[PDB]
Amino acid sequence: SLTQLCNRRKLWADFRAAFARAKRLRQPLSCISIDIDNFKLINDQFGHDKGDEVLCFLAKLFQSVISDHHFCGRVGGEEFIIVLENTHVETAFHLAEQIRQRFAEHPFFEQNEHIYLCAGVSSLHHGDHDIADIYRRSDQALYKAKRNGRNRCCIYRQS
């Protein structure tokens, strides 16, 4: 049911309803973009079923680390998005870091392979009119994180 909790279609719709709800209720709304480092190498070396185990563990990890309500979506081959209602961006950043760390700390497969991820974080801003305004910022923070290597987290700033 991890492929059910991280359904891409449901994610975007839940995210859009959350955006409108967030503006209407004036609540903070945070967004984390995650990309698994070297996921292609993992599938090349261990195969598709094992690559899938990694994805599954990461989804399980989201639940364990984020006890409060949240939406998840696998939006690309190895990219996830987490949407956190009524959550300030710093709290989301801290959650993102915990996910990064526990993923890096989990040994995988008979040979205790270590796998890493990067994350970018942002949240609803006043001038926003679409979830794409938020995703653009978390996506950019993700790629900013990736500039310094694997296993990195960044919060978006306009600075």
Sheet containing strand 152-155, strands side by side: 71-74, 79-85, 29-36, 117-123, 152-155
* CA–CA distances in Å: residue 159 to residues 60, 62, 133, 141, 156: 34, 29, 17, 12, 9
Q: How far apart are CA 96 and CA 141, in angstroms?
A: 12
Binding residues: 35-36, 78
Annotated binding site for Mg(2+): 35-36, 78
Helix (H) or strand (E) holding 131: helix 131-146
CA 44, 45, 47, 52: dihedral to nearest 10 degrees?
A: -90
For 13-65, the DSSP string reads HHHHHHHHHHHHHT--EEEEEEEETTHHHHHHHH-HHHHHHHHHHHHHHHHHH
Domains detected in the chain: 1-159 (3.30.70.270)
Resolution limit in angstroms?
1.9
Method for this entry: X-ray
Closest CA relative to residue 73, chosen from 130, 16, 12: 12
Question: CB–CB of 96/119 below 8 Å?
Answer: yes
How far apart are the C-alpha atoms of 159 and 152, rounded to whole Å? 19
**Catalytic residues, which ones?**
78
